[PDB]
Design a protein around this ligand. Structure first.
Ligand code: CA
Ligand code: CA
Ligand code: CA
Ligand code: CA
Ligand code: CA
Length: 421
């Protein structure tokens, strides 16, 4: 939720007067790198003038600066205002509290307010070394902390025990719960890199997990994954993909994995929307055979909002929509990859909602899929996933998880889910 009107903000307003000392006002701001996005306080230097006042907290939307509304201004416009203020002069800030964090706006797992990594690390150490292992405690803590907070916890645990938290939980847990907790302990890029590597272990590759991750991750996420993957495994992700795929499926996975998709522009390119749509039709349903490189080129290179509009314009040219045309034109891992891809383009939360439903709908559970989605999307779009799940399937994601999993494993997944619908 965003609004550049002070008359449409619902939270409480806070007026504050700050004098810029030698180390700045003493706070970090986040947001504003988008068209419509707020500007919220990230951290406060506990020895700076911002924390001295004590009336500014993390998550406060900056409504105005020096009698000028900064709601809707970019990140560089309001940073230049505070930096132009010399040392010793005053600034006036009207803030707004009641909004989350912008980044984790649609996640189910939020940063824990009264966070204390040392107290958490001790409590996890005490749970581990309790006779029979206190898994409930380990679960209650790690699933109600942000990934950032789980990194501080593992650092404090390592400082206290001289042992790695991940090693200790490995030896204390087992089964699906172990998979969940260890997954949560990795950073988003670390987790995705290790899931990618596992999908390519052995001679046979897990094309479903490879497709799910490569097709759903953004440019920014794929950039970091490529970086951390070479760090962890001493090889480029691209090479491992080249080694474990072939044909047009390899072409599509390599192109997507680069994370070089064009960024969403400011202008809608209507001529290109129509031309791209025409090109997708001519390359497939219109003709005998398929020009797959043309599909690959358009679907990996255009920005997502652009491709959403070409898929709608594509319906003007083809009697089948993009998904139907994929099933008609192409088969195998290539068909699966294209289907996963344009689902992620069209409605990514619905894509994950359907993947979750498929993992539980029948006999047993595809736990690797369920666990990976619950872990990797809990701080991204889990609230949207739950809204699409409930709308389409008529019962909550929570309800399905509860039916399909049991034990502390279930409790961990339910916490990552964040509640019923
Ligand atoms: Ca136990
Ligand atoms: Ca074990
Ligand atoms: Ca393999
Ligand atoms: Ca055909
Ligand atoms: Ca089931």
């Amino acid at each position: 939720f965003f609004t550049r009107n002070p008359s449409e903000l619902k939270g409480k307003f806070i007026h504050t007067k700050l004098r810029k000392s030698s180390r700045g006002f003493g706070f970090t701001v986040v947001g504003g790198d988008e068209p419509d996005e707020f500007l919220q306080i990230k951290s406060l230097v506990l020895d700076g003038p911002a924390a001295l006042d004590g009336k500014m907290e993390t998550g406060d939307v900056i409504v105005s600066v020096n009698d000028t509304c900064v709601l809707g201004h970019t990140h560089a416009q309001v940073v230049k205002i505070f930096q132009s203020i010399p040392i010793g002069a005053s600034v006036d800030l009207e803030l707004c509290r009641g909004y989350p964090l912008g980044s984790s706006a649609y996640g189910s797992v939020k940063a824990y307010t009264n966070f204390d990594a040392e107290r958490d690390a001790l409590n996890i150490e005490t749970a581990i070394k309790t006779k029979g292992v206190d898994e409930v405690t380990i679960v209650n803590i790690l699933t109600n902390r942000s990934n950032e907070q789980r990194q501080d916890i593992a650092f404090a645990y390592q400082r206290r025990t001289k042992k790695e938290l991940a090693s200790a939980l490995k030896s204390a847990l087992s089964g699906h719960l172990e998979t969940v907790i260890l997954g949560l302990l990795k950073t988003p890029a670390q987790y995705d890199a290790s899931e990618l590597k596992a999908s390519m272990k052995g001679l046979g590759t897990d094309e479903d997990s490879l497709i799910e991750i490569i097709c759903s991750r953004t440019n920014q996420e794929l950039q970091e994954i490529n970086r951390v993957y070479k760090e962890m495994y001493k090889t480029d992700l691209e090479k491992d993909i080249i080694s474990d795929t072939s044909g047009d499926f390899r072409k599509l996975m390599v192109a997507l994995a680069k994370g070089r998709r064009a960024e969403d522009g400011s202008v809608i390119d209507y001529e290109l929307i129509d031309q791209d749509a025409r090109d997708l039709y001519d390359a497939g349903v219109k003709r005998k055979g398929t020009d797959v490189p043309k599909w690959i080129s358009i679907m990996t290179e255009r920005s997502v909002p652009h491709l959403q509009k070409v898929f709608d314009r594509y319906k003007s040219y083809s009697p089948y929509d993009m998904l139907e045309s994929i099933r008609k034109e192409v088969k195998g891992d290539l068909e699966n990859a294209f289907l996963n891809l344009v689902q992620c383009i069209q409605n990514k939360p619905l894509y994950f909602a359907d993947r979750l439903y498929d993992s539980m709908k029948g006999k047993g559970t595809r736990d690797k899929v369920l666990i990976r989605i619950m872990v990797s999307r809990s701080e991204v779009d889990m609230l949207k996933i739950r809204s699409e799940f409930k709308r389409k399937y008529g019962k909550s994601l929570y309800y399905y998880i509860q039916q399909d999993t049991k034990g502390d494993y279930q409790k961990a997944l339910l916490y990552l889910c964040g509640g019923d619908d």
